[PDB]
Design a protein around this ligand. Structure first.
Ligand SMILES: [Ir+3]
Ligand SMILES: [Ir+3]
Ligand SMILES: [Ir+3]
Ligand SMILES: [Ir+3]
Ligand code: NI
Ligand code: NI
Lengths: 147, 150
């Protein structure tokens, strides 16, 4: 199942929500519906789950012509295992760095990136925030110290 | 629809197939089915369409543990608008650089990149092949370096 996640980091904090069935903290995200692109899906899910409107950002070579438009590269792509009692699912997760462009927080919690070890999170949440901090730094949206 | 494509370049030539509906030359690829990952889909489509067996290659940070395995980044992701008079298709195309690992050519043509500006290709194929060539040049540098380190 192809899914997508959005990693929003502001002022040393990352916005996480609790997974519906697992009850651990995760990046907002979810399954990419058959009728939407992963980009539309991550924006949709981030807003529905937190009330915050975002835009995926990241690297692109800059291709755009009358026939196609290049979309930003995910921060990372992890093929993840989720084990339910009845069956194990495999999530091909396109994880996108995102930025806030609107909305207002209605659900979710801003977690200090250095205190992530204090809350129960889905596997790799910590490694991924580390990747996000290094990336925001590579874009200069953040100082190396902040990263 | 999410789709995937495989860019295979060997000795200055890129392997292209005629688009199933448009005829124009394009990298092998196709839709990702409900039961598979884009990685599996590109390997399946490439073999079905050309007879060649490939493996996607690309950047990875190297994350792999009991809970997840990182998969290679696509060479580029293009959200394509494919217009037919009947219907327009929106293809979110994960384009992977791939390497040959087996099979045998049964369909498709190895196209000399030096001739591609006079060959009718699907939109953006030429820009994508140029990215593939730069990327392969860099990967070739990294492996020769790893080898020299012996
Ligand atoms: Ir772990
Ligand atoms: Ir023909
Ligand atoms: Ir197709
Ligand atoms: Ir064009
Ligand atoms: Ni699920
Ligand atoms: Ni089609």
């Amino acid at each position: 199942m192809i899914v997508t996640s959005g990693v929003l980091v502001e002022n040393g904090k990352v916005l996480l929500v609790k997974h519906k069935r697992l009850g651990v903290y995760i990046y907002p995200g979810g399954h990419v519906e058959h009728n939407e692109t992963p980009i539309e899906a991550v924006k949709r899910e981030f807003e529905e789950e937190t009330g915050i409107v975002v835009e995926p950002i990241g690297f692109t070579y800059g291709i755009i012509d009358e026939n196609a438009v290049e979309r930003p590269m995910p921060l990372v792509i992890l093929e993840e295992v989720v084990k339910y009692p009845e069956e194990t699912h495999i999530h091909f997760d396109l994880i996108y760095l995102v930025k806030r462009v609107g909305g207002d927080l209605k659900n979710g919690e801003w977690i200090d990136v250095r205190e992530i070890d204090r809350i129960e999170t889905f596997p790799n949440v910590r490694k991924v925030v580390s990747l996000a901090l290094s990336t925001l730094y590579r874009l200069g949206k953040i100082s190396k110290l902040a990263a």
